[PDB]
Structure formats: C-alpha cells, structure tokens
Symmetry: C5
Subunit: 346 residues, 5 copies
C-alpha cells in the first residue's frame, strides 16, 4: 500500500485534525508518561565543583490516541527522527542540569516508534553534568548519594504525570566501572513533586549510592603521614648531647606534616566543618610536635648545674627518655585502634 | 468548540490585527512588567574572576489587551512554547551577564499562559555568570553583597517599566546551601535606573548578602601559622651553646612563614590594599623573625671576653633569655586579644 | 543533456517516488553498510580523564536501488554536499562519544558519490573524544587497548547491519607519530552487538594497541629516585661522631622520597590498586629509611659505657658499619634484577 | 493611521524600491558612519595570553535617504530588532577579535531607531577578548596602552568611512574599577587606515592607558625578598667558630632567593629581555650569595696556623667581620636609592 | 539602469541557467583556484598540545564564465555576503584543523567581488588552531617548522586544482611579533598532494620557520643551575673538621638540582628522547654530586689512625682538597666550551 512516512502524512498532517501543540486526552485525564534510563557512561565526579557527568538514554512512553492506525498491517513504525517536530512530546527537563547537550553526530541520536493503539516510544541520548551536594564529614570513609531528578516545566500535575516503569527503571551498562567509586546495585526510585507559585509540577528522581575506594588515600595520605610519625621516634635513640641532631629532626618532621596536611585538602571544596582526614592529620601533627617538646624538656633538665646533684639531673633526663621510647609507640598504637574502629562502624 | 492552539490562530494570526512587533497600549501609557525570580542553584563564587554562577526561573507578568478572549470558557491557556515567536515579549537583559545561556534539553524550558483579560505569564530558565566586585578589606571576616540587575535594551522609560511584585519577589529553593558562604534571608530590592545618551531605561536589582564560614580558613591558615610561632618559642629552652640548633630553628621557621604567607593569597585577586589575613601573616612573621634576632643578641653578648667580667656577660645573656620565655608568649597573647576583637566588632 | 544536479532533480525529487525517510529495500532484507576509517590525527591521550582525541574520515558504503540511473553516461556523480538532506543516510553513532563535532570551515567537509547501480559512497570528517578505560597495573610498562565502536541508534538488526570492508578497514596517515606512545600495525576488528529492551542493534568496533615509551619515565622518576638511594649510602663513609651530619643526611633523603613519590602520581587517575611505579617508590623509600635506622643502631651501641668493655662497643659499632657499606649496594642490586626482569617478561 | 511596523512594510518592503543589499547613496559619495562605545565591563587582563575581555555597547549612526518618511507624525521609530535583517548595516569588525560573541538572552540585545530624515541609530551589545601586546621592560612600574580598532571588511574607503563623534566618543560606566590597574580618563582617538592588495579600508581606533597598582607586588615580591637579605646579615653577629650555623644560614637564604625569583615570573609571558623585577631579584640574589662568600673568607683566614702569627689571622678574620656589619647594610641602602629613583622618573 | 543586486538576480537566479551546485567549466578542464593568505595574528604556540593558533584572511580566486557580464558598465561588483549561498565556492579545508571557526560579529566577515570576465575574488576571516609536531632534540636551541596545508575534500585533481599566486602568496601584518619566537621572512611554498582510496586530491602548503629566543631560558634555567654548581665549590674552602657544614652543603645543593631539573620539563610534552637542556641538567647534577663524594673521601682518609703516620693522612686529605679547588672550576669551564660550541654550530 502506502509507504509508512507517506502513511504518516495521513497521520501527522493537517488532515484528520492532528495538532502537535495539544496534549493527548485534552480536556480530560492527565497524560501518563512512564520513563526509564540506560546509563552508558558515569564518572568524572568532581568535588571542587560538586558535580558528575553522566551519559544516558532517556526513554519515554505515553499514549496518543490520535496516532492510532488500523489500515497498516504491522505493529510498529520506525519513523525517521526528522519527523519529531510534528508530534507531541513531553517537556521533561532536569532540575540540576548545570549544562547539558544533545548528540548530533552523523544523525540526531533520536528514536521514535508508534504502536497500533498509539503507544509512543521515544528515546534520546543526553549528556548531563548533574549537581549533587557532597557530604564530607568522614571523607575517605564516606558514602555519597548523588541524585538526578526529572521534572515538567510547562504542564502541571493535572495535565502531565511522570512515572517510572516497574520493569528495571534504571539500567546500567556492562563494563561500567569507576576509578574512585563503586556503584551499588540498589537504586532508590521515589517522587520529588515540586510546588511553586505557578503550580504543582510532576517530578521523579533516582538516587545513586557511591562508596569510595580506600586504597588510593592510604598510599598518598595515611601511609606517608604514618612514616613521619615513626621518623620522629628515632630522636629518642640519638644521644642527648647531639643538640643540632635531635632538634633538627624535630623541626623537619613538624614542618613536613604541615605540608602533608595542606596537600590533603588541595582537591576539596572549602568546607568549614572538620572531617576524618583532618582529625588524622591533626593528631599525627600532635605526635611530631610533642616529640620536639620532649627534647626541650630533656635539654632543660640536663643543664641544671656539687657533682652529686649533677648526677641526679642527668639520670632524670635519661629517665624521661626511657619512658618515651615505649610510651609514644604505645599511645599512637591505641589511637589507631580508636580511629579505625570508629570509621569502620560508620 | 475549537482547540486552543487553533483558537490561538484567531488570536495570534494576522486576522483581528495582531502584530508581534508592537508593544501593548501603543501610543499610550508604558507597559508595566512585574517580575520575580526563583533561585534553583547558586554558588561557584570565584574570587579570581570575581563572579558567581546562578540558575534562575525568570518570571514576567504584563498585560496585552489584544490577547483577551471571551468565547473560550476556561480562565487560562497553557500554550506551547513554540508559539512564543508570535507574541510580544519584553527585552529584558542583565547588565552584568558575562555570558549566559538558555536551557534547551528535550524542550526549550519555557512557559506561557494567558488569562481572560490578557494577563500574560512568561517563565524561562536561565543560567547566568554574574559579575560582582569583591571587597576584601577583611578577607576571612567579610560580608559580600553580590547583586543582579535587570534592564531594558530597546524600550525607554516612557514605553516599558520593570517592577518587582509585592508577594515574595525573590524565592529560594529549599535545600540550597553553599560550601563557603551562607545566604541571608533579607534581600534588598531597589531601582537602578540607567541614563545614557540614547535615553533613560528601566532597571530593577536585587542584592544578596553573603557571610562566609570561618572554619575553613582557621584550619588551613590561622592554626598552622599559630604553630610555627609556638615552634619558634622552643628556641629559648635550648642551650645557648647549641649554635647550629637555635639558629637552624630560627631559619626554618622564618622561611616557612614566607611560604605560608604566599600561599594565603594564591586563590585571590591581585589587589593592592592590605587585608586582615595579610596583617595576621605579617605580624606572625614578625614574631618568628624577632626570635632569631633574639639569639643574635644572645650569641653576641656571650662572646664578650679577667673571668670576673666574663661571668657578667654570661649572666646577662641568661637574663635576656629568662625574660623572653615569658615576654614573647605574653605579647602574642595580647595581640590575639586586639586582633580578634577588632574583627568581631566589624 | 541535463546537468547532473538537475538530473538529480529527477532522481531526488518527489517525482518517481523517492522519499528520504525510508530505508532502501524496505519490507525486505536489511541494509548492508560497509565502513572504513582514515585516521588523520591521534593523540592527546589523557589519563586523568581516561580519554583520547582522534580525527577520522568516516566512509560509509551502501546500496540504494532507487538512486540507480541509466540515461546519464558517466559512472559516478560527485554531488554537492548541500543535497545530503535529500538522501537516506544511516544513523551511525559512537557508543563512547564524550562529545564530538563536525568540521564546517569554508564548506561542510562532506562527500557524496553515487554509482550507476546505486552504490552510495559517503565520507565525512569527525573529531571524537573517545573514552577508553585505562588499566594501570604496571604503569610505565603497560600496553593500552583503547577502542572505538560504531552503533545504530534507530534501526535494529533486521533493518540495518554494519560491517567492515575486507580491504584495509582502518587506514592511518603517513606521518602520524605520538609523543608518549607507539601505535601497533595490527588492529583488531570485531563485533560488539548490543542488546537492550528496545531491541538488538548492530555494532562494529576497532581496537588500537598503544605501547608506551620508557625514556620519559626513566629521566623524571627512575633515575632521580636512584640517586637519592645512592645519596643515602654516603652516610656510611662519614664519621660516627658526626651526629648532625649522618642524621641530617638521613632526614633529608627520607623526606624527598616522600616528595618524589607523591609527584609520581600527580598526572594519574585516583585508582586504588598498586602499580609498578608505586612498588618502585615504596622499596626505594625503604632503603633510605632503613639507612637512617642503621645509624640509630650505630649511635645507640656506641654510647654503651671499664674501658675494656668500652672498646667492645666501639668495635661493634664499626663492625655494623663495615657490613652495611657492602650489604646495602648488594641488596639494592639484586632488587633491580628482580624488578626489571619481572616487568620485561610482561 | 497605520501602525509603524506595518508602516515599515511600506518602508522596508519590495515596494518603493528598497533593497537591503545596497548601500545608501549608491554610485555616489561614501557612507559616513560615526561611532561611539560604552564600556560596561573591563578587566580580566591576562598577561600569559596578552589579552583583555571587554563588554561594550557599539553604537553606529549613518543616513539612509531611502528610509525617510513624512506621513508618520513622530520623530523616531523604535523598531523591533527582528526586522534588522531587512535594513542595510555596515560591516564593522575588530582587527584583534580573538573570539567574540553577541548577547542573545531573552531578546537579541539590539536597538534600532530611525529619524524622519533617515538617520539610523543602531546599538548592540558585544563581548570582545581583545589582543594587546604587552611591553614589560619595567614590569611592576609600567603603563600599558591596550587598543581596540574597528575596521570594514567588504567596503573600501570610497564606499564606507568610519568616524568617531565629537561628543564623548568613548563613555565609561560609573562603578568601573579594576583590581590590578587604573584607567586614565584621557583616551586617544585616531585613525589606523589599512592597506592591502584588495584595497584600502577604513579603520578607527581607541587607546586605553592602564597604570598598575604597586601595592600587590610589594607584599608578595619586594618585601619578602627584602627580608631574606636582612636574614643573611645576622650571620655576621654569629660566632666564627659556629661553622654549621653560618654556612647553613648562607645555604638556606641563597636557595630560597632562587625560589622567590622563579616564582616572580610564573604568571608572565616567556619574554627574553630583562625587566625591573628581574634586576631586583638578581641583585638581591647577589647580596645573599656574597654573604656566604664572606664567611668562606672568614673560615679560610682563621685556619692559617708560632702563636704570635696565629693572633694575626684571628684579628684579621675579625677585622673582615666588623667591616661587613656596616658595609653590607650600607651598599644595599644606596642600591635602594638608585633602584627606586630610576623607576620613579620613568 | 538596474541596481547590481537586482542585476545579480539576472545573474545568480534560475534564469539563464545558473546552478550553484555545479563547478565552472563542467565536463571540461579542472577549476584552477589560486590562493594567498594574510596573517593578522600568530602565536600562543603551545608545546604540551603541540599546536598554534593563527588568524588569517583566506583569499581565493577562480573564474566562473557563467558570471560574466557586459551590460553593466563598471569592472567589479562588491556584492553582499548574504548572497554567497547562491554562487559556487571551492571546498577548501585544512588537513590539521584541530578546531576552527568563522568570525560573525556585526556581519559575517566575508568578501565577494566579480570582474567582467567572471574572475571571482573571495576573502574570509578564519581562526585556526593548527597542529604541528614539535622536534625538541635541542630544546632552547631549536628551529621549528610549523606548517599549514590546504586541501579539497570533495573534488579530485581532475576537477579542482589549488595553487599559490606568484605575487606574495603569504603576507604578514606589520606589528606581528612573538614573545618566545621570531618568524623568518623566507616561507616555503610547495605541494602536498594526497592519495587515498577515494582518489587523489589537491593540496598546497606553507612552511613557517620559528627560531626561539635564548634570553628567557638563560634567566630561569641556565643561570640558576650555574649558581648551584658554584655554590658546591665553596665546600672546599670550609674546614675539613666542619662535618655537618660540608655535608649539609652537599645535601642541599644535590637535592635542589633535582628540583631544578624536574621544573625544566613541566611545560613540555612527555617525549622519551634526551634533549639539550636534559644533558645540561644531568652534567650540572654530576658536578654537585661528585662534590659531596669528594668530602666522603676527605672524611674517610682523615680518620685513618703512631702520630707520624697520622700526619700522612691529614696531609693527604689536604692534598686532595688543594687539587679540587682548581680542578673542579677547570673541568666545568671546559665543559661550557664543549656545550655551547656544539649548540652554536647547529
Ligand atoms: C493516568 O493514571 C492515573 C492513575 O492510574 C489515572 O487516574 C485515575 O483513573 C481512574 C480510572 O481511569 C479514575 O477512577 C481515577 O479517578 C483517577 N484518579 C486517581 C487518583 O486514581 C488516569 O486516568 C490516567 N490518565 C490516562 C490518560 O490514562
Ligand atoms: C503603569 O503604572 C503607572 C503607575 O501605576 C501608571 O502611570 C500612572 O497611571 C495613572 C492612571 O492610570 C495616571 O493618573 C498617572 O498620570 C500615571 N503616572 C504616574 C507617575 O503616576 C501607568 O498608567 C501604568 N500603565 C499601564 C499600561 O497600566
Ligand atoms: C545483507 O547481507 C546478508 C549476508 O550477506 C544477506 O542475508 C542473507 O542473504 C541471502 C541471499 O540474499 C539469504 O540466502 C540469507 O537467508 C540471508 N541471511 C543469512 C544469515 O545468510 C542480506 O540479503 C543482505 N541484504 C541486502 C539488501 O543485500
Ligand atoms: C562624507 O564625509 C565627507 C567629508 O565630510 C564628504 O566628502 C566631501 O563632501 C564635500 C561636499 O559634500 C565635497 O566638496 C568633497 O569633495 C568631499 N571630499 C573631501 C575630501 O572633502 C562626503 O560627501 C560625505 N558623504 C555623505 C554621503 O555624506
Ligand atoms: C588549469 O591550469 C592547467 C595548467 O595551466 C591547464 O591544463 C593545461 O591546459 C593547456 C591548454 O589549456 C593544455 O594544453 C594542457 O593539456 C593542460 N594540461 C597540462 C598538464 O598542461 C588547464 O587548462 C587550466 N584549466 C582552466 C579551466 O583554465
Ligand atoms: C570533633 C572535634 C575533635 C577534636 C579532637 C581534639 C584532639 C585533636
Ligand atoms: C593598616 C596598616 C597596618 C600596619 C601594621 C604595622 C605592624 C605590622
Ligand atoms: C603486591 C603487594 C606488594 C607488596 C610489596 C611488599 C614490600 C614493599
Ligand atoms: C641591563 C643589564 C643590567 C645588568 C646589571 C648587572 C648587575 C646585576
Ligand atoms: C646522548 C647521550 C649523552 C650521554 C652523556 C653522558 C654523560 C652524562
């Protein structure tokens, strides 16, 4: 018979009363649009900007009873995407876009198919840079919940309603891994219905739980800060009379821990609250600073000068050294028990 | 009866004398447009560039008596945003744009509805990168007032007048927080009417008060600079004869305070006036530099060499050391009283 | 006779029943499109972003029996690229685009020619920023396999099938070299057929093997880390009584190896697993840290003080020094044998 | 009578012989266009790129005798900017664009009004990133003259002539300040007429004089380099026998002045000639390097060893120390007189 | 008579058989297009990216015998650039674009004029970011040859041929200087004809020779590395018994030369071969490392301890010091002769 685009001339055209500016079931019940996404790419989760770039296939399904047909024999029509300006489409957008674009290389990456009863499937490829507020109270040991939410800009709740479908509403690609995070399989799917002075609008959203990887922040921050604290402990095995040696060891370790602490936050937002790497780098700064304050007590007691009272202060300044060769590895060992268990419960 | 877009053919079309190039009430009183905004996103407040990126819903309300209707029964018409090139719209712009764009993903994020008497509501989503001049006289302790202003480019004051509405002229989203700032609830709403040689044009503006967060700049700048000053004070408890120890402690502390002071301004505009962190990092540099100048007096008096006069200079060089073990923590303590009270009054 | 664009009016126009929205051999066998690419530019292989920018000529060949001709004498028609919106073209895209664009300077860089039997050749110039996941288990000694894959967005497998051609399916330009990598001549060409809930779609892909260049990472990372380890070995030829000399040499070498190790990963993704440069910079950090722990044993044994037992500890602390002048260059020499052979097998 | 856009149908349309492709007074005298600009924003004056971003209102005034009217009563017509593709406009451009764009948010920011005799006023908002070659012979003490020039691309001198108007040809906004510079009120306005092999074209330009702010470069570069030179002078008040103290003070000050000198040019173009901060940082490097060479003479004379000749070399090595405690602050004081007066004359 | 745009209606229109999709002299000899460029801007020659941004006027001259006229009296027609979609233009592009754009501010910066015999002149303004592979075998002493090449995408050699003109085929603006380079006046102009499997296409190219400026890399890299080598030579004038002084001078100079060497390649591509600054920074690292190895021989010989044999080792360890006070400035002086003459021949 007729070819389907020329059959769509009798379906999209001005004959038979079709207008692409009017929603289906007009002056009636609202349009029920059900949605699911397919995540191709995910990542580049920046924390200075507090955003993440995603690449999705946005699928939408509604029903247009004006687009029903019965003369054509087959069940679906793979229409050309240049004829998408002639149908009605919902005005979905993202409440946290922060910039987005289509993909237009070699063809607009768009998809249209219409069933016999008017069921319209519409899939497009979108790249989003979605804004999620980070919560960094325990920074290497945190779980982030970055969301994406899908709203309607022009049609209110009594005209257009978004839903998720009950058969896998968020699909993820096969080889989709992350360098810093892991993506949990459970995904929250709930409503986020927005109220304004204009009206109430539909909104659906999807939460993504991101658990980090411990292994990077151990190698750069935890292990080298653990070596400078041990480097301060060899001052106690050096002679007391070696005054430029034990002081110059105390200076250099207490001023690299300032450098290691400032470099721990170079790729972070400038948040005011204190985090788990900050209370590691402040207590590890306290051990290397109280080791140089130990020798200031050793150097002050030993100068107190009868040689019978002189033997008291030398044996006292050696008594304060034999205690600290055991006590400072012992207090730092029971700090590691209190630190890592607190951030393994959470 | 007729569908409303085809009813808008009898309302927007060339019949009944409607032209989308002519303002309403032409050859009459000026067009009164009232406006309010809704702030979705706010932040990325850069200081090197002195700007901030915002994401608003710009709502505009005017009256077009040509767009009145009485045959259609309902009170409003949710028209399609593709028919916005057929109505008259005001030429609002921003006097401090520095680049801006629309949002066009899956639909142009636009909104149109027309009342029965011709009241037109027009809402669009805009992303702005607005320029605000920073005032950094007291940099961690300042309050910034970054503005946005809304002008008319083509129509003068006798043709088009902007207003704010008297019912919440600036709304803010619910979970809108900032990493570095807090946004005060009181918002100034005043006029900024511009005069040129072309004419006088309407202008309305809105001030936003931004108070910082103290907790970031304490952890990175105030507390580590406070430790290097205390690190200079342990030189006084070291033996006077330890010449490479007390000098090498004075060198290393006075040359990391140069490093800490240059890093205090790495993310700042290159302003010439002196600020509150600069007079902290210069006085804290004065304590660590006058502690090494103290030992240059200790090392010079002790070399002055009868052994009866030799006992005078050693007891004098110990007299200058017992004073400075009390005096230098005392002067720095009464500087912290004068510093933090001065920047708590302001 | 007629000029070929006006002959294409009788070939592309609405006469003779040609529609540019309908695939060839409609209601029949699927469209067989064969493809080959020509790589002009290649490089800027970023590892923080894990992507690479390429510049290709994408050639596509199919058959449209509607575009056959017999009146015109010649075998091909170099048509103008402005008449490409009037023919049918396949909807090829890239599953790992991450942004791409056309080249439109002085003309849309496009090419069309049609044979007598309807064979259509279509070449365009595309710039792609293709995403490839890096595998950095042995980072200076790795081979990366970065792919590119070519899919169909709208037409399923029963409507459109992609192939490679059997005569050089990937060509490379003549003077195409890379600063960091070399491109192997063998290129894998296989299928990547994607299944969704929408349908199954065609996919072809091409693997590119990238072997690095050793010579950069030797000069910056391996050789300067090899000098600091040798710099720690001159402590054993310094007098034992020079306590600020041998300690201050141990401090400075063990705290620059922390700086050299953190700078080894400044241009890398924040991956958690350990790599070959990390186990070089951790063992080279172990030699410079166990050289300062050697002198802490030398300084502790020599202080143990009858002068007959005093001569035992001095000769014992010299015995531990004569061993380490041979043993520490010997263990580091047999570590270089185990390190470089392990990463020459792989 | 008729509304003015429909009156412009009888003025812009194909009736009465109006063509928007033909300049006014065709086959006659050239078109005299007079221009003035209004600078909204100014700044972001980069020196690595040697450019500056400006935001102007470009106003143009010419006369089109085809656009004269006498039936309409008023003196001017605020026409809609969508009807700007129907009039003739001059082809003004900028010879140092380096990228530029229009402003299109909520309306194309354009302005058109036509007088009764045909005088056409045309104002648009443009953002420019204008290229100006920096002259950095005396870098903190320089005055830069960054220009902007306005040419014609298609029409030669015998068809179109640009002028400035004699009533304020460059206006500046009220609160327009700069963080690093000040903008002088005197602005040069002269001709820059370009000759090619195509023809001679009109050109007008406007010079802007930019004087810097001294106060930033004192705080970061001049004052901390002045402290390290004073820090070298305390070596002369330390005992001569303190060999690791006076040498280790000479090493650390001469190797931070290398760091301070390299950081003085991190935000600069890589120019080959020597500038005023380079001859400050090289002479201040000469004082801290000749202070360590002073102790190498003190340490060499004092080792020359009858004890009667031994008392000669110790008193000679103390004679060379008492001179340098006065001479080195004296030579550096008379260098500051010669340095700052030379760069206050210029 | 008729105005020339309306005369161009009888010249460009569908009357008299003109089609803008067909090349001139069709079914005949190929179209000879001659070209010349005018370089407005040049620079921003990045080396990490290995590209350079240029701003040219691209002029093209061909002959269209369909566009000849004899009724109109004058010799040329300055046509409006909006009528450029109605003529035939060659499909010139650049084989190393890496992104490019037009300039569209206030008018498309385009130019068209047609002689009486049909000679068409066509000039446009283009900004290019052209890719040139750097050759950095002798990096501060190199001459770079960065090219640009102009090809045809659709028309082969038998349809369209590019040429340069014999009267100044590349012009350069007057005040066009570079911060890092100088541009030689001799410019190579040759052919680059490309062969594919599609066909053979025309190509012309132009080489630009860029000689650097020595004066920047002396101030930052050569002179400060020359001071650290001299700084190592003052160790020989310090007492042998000053063990923390001569060792601590050897440590600090040998670990800043690692810092100076890594900073010599921070703005470079990661190339594997060795360059002229690398063999400067490796030999200058060899002098500062063999000066600390000198004192390890001084400190080891002097410890060898009858006092008659004790006077032998002290006089031997002073003999090895008097040689090196002459020998090390002598070997470094004859290295500067061999280094700078080798890179003055090339
Ligand atoms: C869209 O979905 C909703 C819920 O399925 C429908 O709203 C209800 O429809 C039933 C029967 O159609 C009515 O009995 C109810 O009064 C409706 N409201 C509620 C709250 O249950 C709606 O009809 C659907 N619209 C379309 C076009 O299918
Ligand atoms: C726009 O608002 C202004 C102020 O409300 C109106 O201007 C006044 O209107 C009243 C009566 O309409 C007059 O008595 C005054 O002379 C006007 N001017 C002033 C300064 O008060 C104006 O009419 C409104 N325009 C429209 C179309 O509603
Ligand atoms: C596209 O290529 C395939 C394989 O060459 C063709 O599919 C086969 O065609 C032959 C004969 O034409 C049939 O016997 C087979 O049943 C087909 N399928 C398979 C799996 O072999 C297909 O015909 C080609 N389509 C076009 C338009 O040429
Ligand atoms: C544009 O301005 C110039 C200078 O004002 C005009 O050129 C002169 O016009 C006068 C009289 O009109 C003549 O006597 C001269 O011969 C012209 N040339 C010079 C060098 O003085 C020109 O006429 C003006 N063009 C228009 C359309 O007004
Ligand atoms: C373009 O230039 C070439 C060379 O000038 C022309 O090709 C030659 O033209 C002459 C006479 O026209 C013939 O004798 C030759 O056979 C041609 N080929 C060669 C290799 O010399 C060509 O005619 C020119 N085309 C146009 C339209 O002018
Ligand atoms: C949440 C405050 C922690 C304070 C820790 C005190 C020891 C550094
Ligand atoms: C506003 C000038 C402050 C100067 C402080 C002086 C002590 C550093
Ligand atoms: C794969 C783990 C390697 C651990 C090496 C242990 C010595 C540093
Ligand atoms: C213009 C050359 C200045 C050279 C100064 C010499 C002393 C550093
Ligand atoms: C081209 C190899 C040069 C090697 C120089 C050896 C001395 C550093």
């Amino acid at each position: 018979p007729m070819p389907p685009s020329e059959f769509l001339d009798k379906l999209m055209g001005k004959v038979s009363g079709y207008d692409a500016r009017i929603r289906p079931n007009f002056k009636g019940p609202p349009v029920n649009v059900t949605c699911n996404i397919f995540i191709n790419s995910f990542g580049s989760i920046a924390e200075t900007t507090m955003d993440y770039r995603v690449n999705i296939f946005l699928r939408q399904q509604w029903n247009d009873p004006r687009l029903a047909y019965s003369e054509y024999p087959d069940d679906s029509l793979d229409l050309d995407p240049s004829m998408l300006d002639s149908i009605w489409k919902p005005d979905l957008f993202f409440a946290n876009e922060k910039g987005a674009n289509f993909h237009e290389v070699t063809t607009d990456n768009k998809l249209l198919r219409i069933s016999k009863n008017g069921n319209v499937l519409y899939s497009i490829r979108i790249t989003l840079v979605l804004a999620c507020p980070m919560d960094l109270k325990n920074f290497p040991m945190d779980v982030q919940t970055c969301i994406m939410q899908l709203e309607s800009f022009g049609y209110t709740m009594n005209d257009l309603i978004f839903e998720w479908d009950e058969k896998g509403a968020v699909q993820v690609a096969d080889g989709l891994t992350l360098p810093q995070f892991i993506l949990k399989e459970e995904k929250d799917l709930r409503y986020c219905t927005k109220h304004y002075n204009t009206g109430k609008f539909t909104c659906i959203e999807a939460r993504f739980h991101l658990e980090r990887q411990m292994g990077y922040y151990l190698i750069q921050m935890y292990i080298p800060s653990l070596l400078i604290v041990i480097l301060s402990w060899v001052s106690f095995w050096i002679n007391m009379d070696a005054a430029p040696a034990r002081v110059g060891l105390g200076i250099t370790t207490v001023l690299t821990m300032t450098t290691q602490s400032s470099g721990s936050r170079a790729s972070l937002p400038k948040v005011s609250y204190v985090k788990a790497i900050d209370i590691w780098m402040a207590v590890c700064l306290l051990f290397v600073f109280s080791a140089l304050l130990e020798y200031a007590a050793v150097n002050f007691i030993a100068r107190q000068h009868v040689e019978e009272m002189r033997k008291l202060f030398i044996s006292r300044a050696k008594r304060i050294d034999t205690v600290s060769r055991v006590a400072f590895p012992l207090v730092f060992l029971i700090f590691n028990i209190f630190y890592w268990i607190t951030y393994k419960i959470i």
